[PDB]
């Protein structure tokens, strides 16, 4: 099971990299665990989008203040 989980996580990381999603190993693992546990994919996608939007807003504020 552990080997299968590792292989799945590596496949997901490769897919994210090819798609340029910007997700790290920990965030991808948390999302995978939530989806496997029955979390609504729309809620998870909205959460990921909000976190990415927050990072982009913080970067825009840092670039405007610099």
């Amino acid at each position: 099971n552990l080997n299968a989980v590792r292989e799945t996580m590596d496949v997901l990381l490769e897919i994210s990299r090819i798609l340029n999603t910007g997700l790290d190993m920990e965030t991808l693992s948390i999302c995978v665990r939530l989806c496997e546990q029955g979390i609504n994919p729309e809620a998870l996608s909205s959460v990921i989008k909000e976190l990415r939007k927050a990072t982009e807003a913080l970067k825009a504020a840092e670039n405007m203040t610099s």
């Binding site: 729309e42 909205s46 989008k49 909000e50």
Partner: protein, 50 residues
């Protein structure tokens, strides 16, 4: 529709926090409450010292 919903929820959260802050700013007997508590402590100290 999903994007609109998510944006609306985010805006609702931000607006709730802003409204809380605005009400705290304009409702703000808290400074007056602290000054009344300070006057209570000072009157209590004057009672203990007398």
């Amino acid at each position: 529709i999903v994007n609109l919903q998510v944006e609306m929820i985010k805006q609702f959260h931000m607006q709730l926090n802003e409204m809380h802050s605005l009400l705290e700013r304009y409702s703000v007997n808290e400074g007056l409450v602290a000054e009344i508590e300070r006057l209570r402590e000072e009157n209590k100290r004057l009672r203990a010292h007398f």
